[PDB]
Amino acid sequence: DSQEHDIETTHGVVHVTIRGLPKGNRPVILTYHDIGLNHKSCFNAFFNFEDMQEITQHFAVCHVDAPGQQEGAPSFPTGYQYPTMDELAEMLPPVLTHLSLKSIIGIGVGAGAYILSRFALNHPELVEGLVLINVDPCAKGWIDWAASKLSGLTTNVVDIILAHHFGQEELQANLDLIQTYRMHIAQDINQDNLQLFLNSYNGRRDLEIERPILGQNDNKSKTLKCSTLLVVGDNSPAVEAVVECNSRLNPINTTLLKMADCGGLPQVVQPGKLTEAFKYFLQGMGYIP
Amino acid sequence: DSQEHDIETTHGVVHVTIRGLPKGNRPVILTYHDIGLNHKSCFNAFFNFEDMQEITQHFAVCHVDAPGQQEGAPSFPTGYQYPTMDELAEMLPPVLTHLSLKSIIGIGVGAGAYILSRFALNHPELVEGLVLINVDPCAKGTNVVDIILAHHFGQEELQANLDLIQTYRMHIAQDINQDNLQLFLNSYNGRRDLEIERPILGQNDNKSKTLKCSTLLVVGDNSPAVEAVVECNSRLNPINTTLLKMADCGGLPQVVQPGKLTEAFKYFLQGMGYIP
């Protein structure tokens, strides 16, 4: 049913898990998780969902785990030159090659969404679709003006990442979802290693995507060539960014999905609704008639 | 590099024009023109355009001419039972069968867009994509050439009566057998509601039925269609649908602005994975 690989790249080992058996012409639904998650935390709930299972039947699922984020990962030595976001994306063609895959339908969350998007800009041949959840193509704001002070380099990691995931009101309520995902961030990931991955995602440069004007397309400023499903909860802190990302992609190949009564982790909070959206998206490309 | 066929169906002959040789698994780009046009009037301008030629290259093109609307068509006897819009759509599977075509990427205008939309609802597996130009999915509720001019061109556009409009008066007037054109107009004005309805991601929505293919709705900012085309968009699945309002444009976007619409169509094809 499942098969783990530790794949060697010029930027270090990356751990991937292939559940289901890849097919001749069919692409694999490839997965990159967000900061403070691994593949298991981010999507295992979503891909185990009854309706999604009928989709994962036809496609093989290759879960990528960002370097050092894989469960039971050893700490990198303090000097360690953890890969840049751009570099993390340069690890994926090796992954595809090693598993003899020809193309992928990506599903990314935050850091994942950026990585897969960079990857798809770098390698349009290997990307057919992207479902980008809570994606931010702009570089991290040096300050959030909706706060009481600035204290960037002297606050807890787990609390930073929680904030990145969950809306202000959702986080203050501190319900089973938040308590559950404090514990996931604190215990499931190597805290030493996680700091490096966080730092990589916080250092991300601007994607550079710009929507083209159909008339007089001379400059042809680059965007994603593939079909894209941008997904964000109404109450995700991401909404500002995800709408901006949509403002910079080709509307003929892009759809925005603002999920109702939703915050961080739409794929776990409302997997029933997101599945059906993914199903329509796949049907667009000609799969799952 | 073209071939004409008169294809006899249960509901009568339909004249089609295949330019290019069909591939085994690639769909053909199939065409259905609007009231008061034929494929030449409606699409010849667009499909010959430089940038489109490089697309049409990799697909076969199959141009359908609505009954009696094809060039040199003889007038049907006065009693003649002209096909309903629903019937006109039922004539397409036979066209596909007889030319041994497996599936199509449809480009419709007005009546054409309804007909190809009806077709897709009836036979989803056969439709892979639809470029619906100036489509109207609702029912309507003297001089025929003037009526049709009005259907096509914006009020301001039409009052200005420039090269485009005086060219297309003559097209409507002299290209198509006038007896037949009335019957076709009658069929399009009788069109029933498509009965598409946008699905709610939570409600299963069994009763509601929508196009299951990738759709590019196209209208010019000044087209009388705009209200209807936006209506259409509001009733299709947003995950499989894009609305394209074309700047400084009225009737016949595909003629007025082929450069823009080509580019749109190329990205729409790239969405489904073709012309990589």
Author numbering:
A (entry chain A): 29 to 317
B (entry chain B): 29 to 169, 183 to 317
Q: What does the article say, verbatim?
A:
The N-Myc downstream-regulated gene (NDRG) family is a member of the α/β-hydrolase superfamily and is repressed by Myc expression. Although NDRG3 has a high structural similarity to the α/β-hydrolase family, the substitution of the residues of the enzymatic catalytic triad and narrow folded cavity due to the presence of helix α7 and helix α10 indicate that NDRG3 is a nonenzymatic α/β-hydrolase fold protein. The NDRG3 ΔNC structure includes two domains: A canonical α/β-hydrolase fold domain and a cap-like domain. Compared with NDRG2, the helix α6 region of NDRG3 is a flexible loop.
Interestingly, although NDRG2 and NDRG3 share high similarity in terms of their sequence and structure, the helix α6 region in NDRG3 ΔNC was disordered, whereas that of NDRG2 was presented as a clear electron density map. In the crystal structure, we suspected that the space between the adjacent molecules is confined and that the helix α6 fold could be disrupted due to the lack of space caused by strong disulfide bonds between each Cys30. To Increase the space for the helix α6 region, we designed a disulfide-deficient, denoted as NDRG3 C30S. The crystal structure of NDRG3 C30S mutant was determined with four monomers in an ASU at 3.4 Å resolution. Unexpectedly, when the helix α6 region of chain A was modeled alongside its electron density map, the region was a loop and interacted with chain B. While the intermolecular interaction of the helix α6 region in the C30S mutant was the result of a crystallographic artefact, the region does not seem to form a helix, based on the crystal structure of C30S mutant. As such, the helix α6 region in NDRG3 ΔNC is a flexible loop in contrast with that of NDRG2 and α/β-hydrolase proteins. Moreover, the crystal structure of NDRG3 C30S, which counteracts the effects of disulfide bonding, and the CD results of NDRG3 ΔNC and NDRG3 C30S mutant provided evidence that the helix α6 region in NDRG3 ΔNC is a flexible loop.
